[PDB]
Write a protein that binds this ligand. Sequence first.
Ligand SMILES: C[C@@H]1C[C@H]2[C@@H]3CCC4=CC(=O)C=C[C@]4(C)[C@@]3(F)[C@@H](O)C[C@]2(C)[C@@]1(O)C(=O)CO
Lengths: 12, 244
Amino acid sequence: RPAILYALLSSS
Amino acid sequence: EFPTLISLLEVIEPEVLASGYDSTLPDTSTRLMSTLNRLGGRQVVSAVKWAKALPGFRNLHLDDQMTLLQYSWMSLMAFSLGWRSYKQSNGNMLCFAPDLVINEERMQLPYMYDQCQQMLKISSEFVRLQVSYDEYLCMKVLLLLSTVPKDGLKSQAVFDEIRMTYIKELGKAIVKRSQNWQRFYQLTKLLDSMHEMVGGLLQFCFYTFVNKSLSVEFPEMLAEIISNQLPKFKAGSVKPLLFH
Ligand SMILES: C[C@@H]1C[C@H]2[C@@H]3CCC4=CC(=O)C=C[C@]4(C)[C@@]3(F)[C@@H](O)C[C@]2(C)[C@@]1(O)C(=O)CO
């Protein structure tokens, strides 16, 4: 699973 | 009362990024493709922010949100590129960024001519149909919702309802401007043909990504997306949603 993408979706 | 969905789509539309392409160094294809991918990664980050602000989108399961963005990033970026090229040059040139246009000395670079022709195709459809801003915004949402795994999604129910919302919205933008049903037909034909126009771009992307000799660079964002996407596309477990 694409980490930067997933992280981007989980955060801000 | 509450702002219309269409007005919200306008406020959340990202500003055009600058590339910082240095047209001072000599034009090479490896360097141009590398610059384009760098600008691509940034635009995709921008598209994650945009999708998050998208009424309804956050109600999908995180896996589905990820899936949709993974499968449609290329079509989102190519659609906006078509839009900017249409507005800024009436479809005569590709306008990637304010500091990055494709002129004839860089369209003549190895590997460039074919990929640029495919991208200008998209632009010239906007010209043919004289697409309005609002039509464009609704269509761009529908693109985000147009490619799904053959095995379906998790939150299929929320997904189906989200599509219905934005199909309504495209219908409304068509109403608020030929004949309504003909226009809807033409725009949904345009959406359908995006799957074909973009399949070719993906193929070339996969090639420049896997080709060791060519040394085209990808930022880590795109690298991770592409790296994951490639086995799913080989295996053919990716389904286009088509209107026709
Ligand atoms: C032909 C393909 C399609 C290209 C993409 C087309 C859509 C797009 C629009 C932009 O405004 C910026 C970047 C992207 C997202 C892109 F232009 C670059 O990433 C380079 C790209 C993948 C490509 O040129 C390559 O595979 C080069 O490696």
